[PDB]
Amino acid sequence: ALAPRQVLDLEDLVFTQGSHFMANKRCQLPDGSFRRQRKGYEEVHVPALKPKPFGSEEQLLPVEKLPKYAQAGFEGFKTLNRIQSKLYRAALETDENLLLCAPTGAGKTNVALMCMLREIGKHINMDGTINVDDFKIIYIAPMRSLVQEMVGSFGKRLATYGITVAELTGDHQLCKEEISATQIIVCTPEKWDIITRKGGERTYTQLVRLIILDEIHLLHDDRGPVLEALVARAIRNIEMTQEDVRLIGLSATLPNYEDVATFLRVDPAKGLFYFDNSFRPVPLEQTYVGITEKKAIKRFQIMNEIVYEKIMEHAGKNQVLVFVHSRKETGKTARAIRDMCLEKDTLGLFLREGSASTEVLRTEAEQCKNLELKDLLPYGFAIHHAGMTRVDRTLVEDLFADKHIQVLVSTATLAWGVNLPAHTVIIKGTQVYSPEKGRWTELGALDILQMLGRAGRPQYDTKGEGILITSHGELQYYLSLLNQQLPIESQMVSKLPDMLNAEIVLGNVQNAKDAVNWLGYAYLYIRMLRSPTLYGISHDDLKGDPLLDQRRLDLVHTAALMLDKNNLVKYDKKTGNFQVTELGRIASHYYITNDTVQTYNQLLKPTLSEIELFRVFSLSSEFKNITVREEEKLELQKLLERVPIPVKESIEEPSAKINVLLQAFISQLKLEGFALMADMVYVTQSAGRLMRAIFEIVLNRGWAQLTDKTLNLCKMIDKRMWQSMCPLRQFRKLPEEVVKKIEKKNFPFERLYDLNHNEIGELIRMPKMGKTIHKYVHLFPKLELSVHLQPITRSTLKVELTITPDFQWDEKVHGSSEAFWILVEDVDSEVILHHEYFLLKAKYAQDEHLITFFVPVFEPLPPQYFIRVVSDRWLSCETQLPVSFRHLILPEKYPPPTELLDLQPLPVSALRNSAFESLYQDKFPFFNPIQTQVFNTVYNSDDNVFVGAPTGSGKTICAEFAILRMLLQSSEGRCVYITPMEALAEQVYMDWYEKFQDRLNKKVVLLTGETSTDLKLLGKGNIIISTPEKWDILSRRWKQRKNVQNINLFVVDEVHLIGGENGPVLEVICSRMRYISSQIERPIRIVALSSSLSNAKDVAHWLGCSATSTFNFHPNVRPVPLELHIQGFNISHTQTRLLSMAKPVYHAITKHSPKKPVIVFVPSRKQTRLTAIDILTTCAADIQRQRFLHCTEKDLIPYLEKLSDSTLKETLLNGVGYLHEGLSPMERRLVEQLFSSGAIQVVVASRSLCWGMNVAAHLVIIMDTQYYNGKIHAYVDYPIYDVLQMVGHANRPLQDDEGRCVIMCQGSKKDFFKKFLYEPLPVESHLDHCMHDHFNAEIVTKTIENKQDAVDYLTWTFLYRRMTQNPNYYNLQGISHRHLSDHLSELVEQTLSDLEQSKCISIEDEMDVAPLNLGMIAAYYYINYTTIELFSMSLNAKTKVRGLIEIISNAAEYENIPIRHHEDNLLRQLAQKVPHKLNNPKFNDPHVKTNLLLQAHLSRMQLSAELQSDTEEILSKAIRLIQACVDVLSSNGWLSPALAAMELAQMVTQAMWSKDSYLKQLPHFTSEHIKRCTDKGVESVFDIMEMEDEERNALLQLTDSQIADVARFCNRYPNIELSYEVVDKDSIRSGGPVVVLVQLEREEEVTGPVIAPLFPQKREEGWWVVIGDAKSNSLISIKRLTLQQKAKVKLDFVAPATGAHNYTLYFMSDAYMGCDQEYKFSVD
What we know:
The protein is elongated. The longest helix has 26 residues, at 674-699. It is of the alpha/beta class. Strand 31 (1049-1053), helix 40 and strand 32 (1085-1090) form a beta-alpha-beta unit. The chain folds into 12 domains: 32-52 and 281-488, 3-Layer(aba) Sandwich (Rossmann fold); 53-280, 3-Layer(aba) Sandwich (Rossmann fold); 489-580, Arc Repressor Mutant, subunit A (Orthogonal Bundle); 581-722, CATH 1.10.3380.10; 723-779, DNA polymerase, domain 1; 780-888, C2 domain (Immunoglobulin-like), CATH 2.60.40; 889-1118, 3-Layer(aba) Sandwich (Rossmann fold), CATH 3.40.50; 1119-1324, P-loop containing nucleotide triphosphate hydrolases (Rossmann fold), CATH 3.40.50; and more.
């Protein structure tokens, strides 16, 4: 943005006088303009404009005329006011921005109300009355007093709507997520500015449909620039979000009002309304006395005398109001008349001519209150002031409008605070002290205008007067103001460098060009165009520069330079670009001026003392105009002695006055000198933010001592008490002296915990209070802490911190949460190595919380680190816990990574075979530096090799080398390839089936869920692709199956996943392969590919890899070099942090990859949609709509026609696609295809999909690194494995010379990523935590027969190797060979002791082990051992289909079904809709969930995508569990249960319930069909098999496509016929054997799977032949069989005695209902 720039001096261009500025050259007066020199003073009069008659037809609107829904909240009103009637149509029937200019007190309120009512009327909902959660309305009033006024009266009018209106304004650092539950926020501009600088601000503003600007003429005030920021900000977000927000502005009648209309985007023809003085509520005649000379006391007696004679044209009936500038003067000024109105011949005495108890009886009976009030009450007098008066204040308010109170002098505060208008008002003086300017100045234009808007009572008056006593000198300014003539200007130049910084920090402006555009949104721009001369711009300049391009560029340059000086922004004149600093970020967030930041940055240092920190606060530029006056020096000398902190060298300079002012505020010292009170209020109202700004500065630099000091200083200011004092002071219900009494003792607070109420009451010598003091001591927040540590490397430790609440919760005391800071400090407590925010929600109090983080360490190790957990609110509420390093064993240092040899890139011609080279010749000429260096050893060898390279490097083909070499040596070679993730498996299967079965014609196969059909693939295949649990369940029985033994090559991909969840299964199957290899003496080649590992040696030597053939490369040696940028966001609350990341994401795309492709990973499905729409809408507001679509819309339209997501079509048209799991596998393939072609430039994808994407970008942006766990009610970090994978996608070897990645994370995570991304990952094993299932299977298969075998098995593992390398990780406490053997033994012992207590194995002779029934079936079905433990524990003789689902949903395999956000509510809804209701059902229990999903699937209910996806994962393991249940019920001999369980198998398969009609298995049937079937007689599937074609579909609605599927169903539907016989039925006897032979045969050849469209897995027909005695409920014998065409089934048992035994024979499918035959019979 290089262009000629000129440094301005703002002090030259600024309107110095602020509000008091008059661009008003002249000034004209009305008709009556008489001037009367009573000569101590000039009186200028202007009379009341006659009432303006009703114009062109326009007439008042009786309330019943506006629509029915709006009537409400206008109670007590017969008719609309004239102004309100003029705009009822605009405010109610249109959504147009309005600018309503009217006289003060015109009643602009009810107009804003009609505007609200329109928005409220937009969420009707028929029966349900309001959609209170769907919208929000912000209302900006400009005074704190007015806001409270408004909340109450808007509160009233909208009760009948059930709408919540609440104040937000005040100093209170934002919290309340019940502001998430209020719809009308009422606040001040500066409050709303603070909120909306947050960036995650879009959590509040998300729903804001309408914002209202009361008293918008504040534009002109020194506070004006805040309004200009709000509106500029708001307007600009309307364009970026493209969601419409309505702006209503309400103003007084002042010049420039039409420039304000333009500012607010008001259509002049449609929504501009201006109403001159005619439209006053009550016509006011007005006097403007200015006065002639100095003469202080004389000038005031002048003034005080003026007041009497004016009131006394009102004797009996009339009310008066006087305004003064001091809560002291409410009485003093009413005294100078008390000393006059009655002092000269009791003039006008008896203002209440009820010298007869008319008004006095009600006035004298209310006298018994305090001060000047009881004093002034018995006659018509009263007072109202800002000097805290509370409940009596609200009682001078009723008795005034009840009309007993005659005279009431008051503070400006009342004009704003409550709507009580007098008949006349008089304004004494117009001079006020301003702490910020540090002088007296002329009181604000806003202020006056509100006061005279109180002359005359709307329902009770016909005229009103208004007298304004000011100084004659240069105060015809008030004539101007009060007669529609003082123009409204822009004060934006004053506040320009702070305003700019907030936008830079917000991400709204990244350079000067952006900033110049920003200025175009401000009121300044409009005003400079319209009156350029006034804003220092020559008519010549304007004429050649009509858009003020030179001025805005200059203004911004000048500001940028101030911010750069003060180190708030980094700004280079060259590019015009801006970079935010931390200092600037804090400045913006805490509302500190940039000069103050500089001072802080200059003064703050680790060794700053409390003395010096009180000093630094004093030097804050917000206080730079503060002087020490003479009349106050004595009192400051007095305060200095009573406060605690020494105030050095500073004698009474202003530095020291500010210093002691703060200390006296914390000490709650009383004051007198009102000049000093206004200064104290001004430094304390600020002190909160300034301290907290200093805290955040110092926290983030790591300064431990100063972080402690400042945090306490914050708490002390908030809590108004010293650290010295008693923490019991924080409980406001405790009487003061009771507490000073506990302080009077030299007794530590801590020791109160150990004292009972008696001993307390005793120590205090006030036994009355013993009990309640006790209550409060235990309400004090208190945490217990416990730490667990594990070394990771010699620099980093993983730390699990367990936080245990130990206090009583009272929501009156603690509310809905308590926040804490977790601080990890070094030995000396000088440095914070790590910190983070912990929010203890109330719902989850007294739950244990586990916070996990990593901390650095340095080899000359200290003895201790400390962990402090300090409250963020309560004083003296901390808890420390040392972390000893005395017995810590750091791991063995790692070797360097293998060198990268710059070899001349090997051509494809180095592969010699011509058939082979065709697979690569047409893709590239030369392999990458890793593939070539490796090639030597993997193509030209038969030995074991390990490749370690950053994901993306192209490891896949290194494995190919080996497979090519195998097909070169073997004809029908056998090769197994194992990837950890299933999603990777399918990706490699497509990739290779075409490369190896299409191209090279060898078989290539993919293992599935079923063992028998997989055993075949294992046989015919030359390349077998599999996930670990699949290869495990096969090769477990490697002794039996030969095919496992004769494999030539074994390829493991992503071996680093061994350290991941589900790593065990991989480590196991790998170790087994190595074991099998040494034992079969025909070595198996093992080839492992992995991410860069620090400890690759250990994985190499584990898998038999020499150091010659072990290739482990550093991340920086990646073929396509990566540019990592880690970007932190200090926002603890996740929903907010995600929102504040949205702008940075677009800036990331435009900076790092404007043309080239991008992938954004987001944490979830609905985030994927939201993030894409944002990129789009932001793209369109950047005026570059569709800059991501790199073809033409027509080019895409053939493809998009297929899709069904309306939104995916819309985003794709615009250049952005998204990938979540709710999309058809087709739709996903489309999006990826279009991305790889380059047609679309950006894909947003959910993190669950970083494994199943064969798509690469130029830039990868990870948007947050956390996801919610509904099981522990907390966000948890992405596995570093997922993040490593995501990053690997920023990699296009062919085109890009670089890849780029931007990770956006919470700050607390930042340092974690900086370590473990620029460096190699270390893996450990978690075998020891999953030891059982593998031993139990090894024992079943007699690979382990004794304890020594168990111990030797383990020598083959990775576990075995790492234990000695990092003992402390495994909880080994030494490293000798002895420690190893011990721990190994201790390990096998417990694992076998568990498996035996669990009834799976038998321990005999202490050394020998054997498989038991439970053990054998858990290995057979691959079910966790605790699962069958639970089955046998819970199944009984009487359990039915209902109880069965309950037990099976309790399987451990369902532990991992996750709970996600708001599924807590979703599952509760399911719960009321399913057939079976649960008792004590915990909705964050994965077992309660899989229960409901189980009944949901049976009911055929369709659900949300991630419930359906889970339903599939549940159904995945469903069948193997039921089968276990059969085995266990039969092995116990229970008949009716085992039958019940077989029904469940077939009814989970077909997706129907126990009493569901058998016809529900047939395609396209519904309840409507079945009812019109029982009416005929059709109740069976066989009852439609005998029917012929014409009668068949004559029954109900058919289509040619319906008949097709249905008739094909009945052709796979089992038509079996049975045959049985008792072998030697007559020569059978008691105790003896009985052999039963059952003959099965079907009249149909078997081709096709089991058809079960609702079951996500293709399964084959299993059958159960059973024999039982129904009378006793006895399972006699059973056999499970897959039948094909026909077969002989043999089952025997042992006869009981006495001949006659009646038996039953059962034939049971595990897949269909209605095939179940029964045959009765007898024997003996």
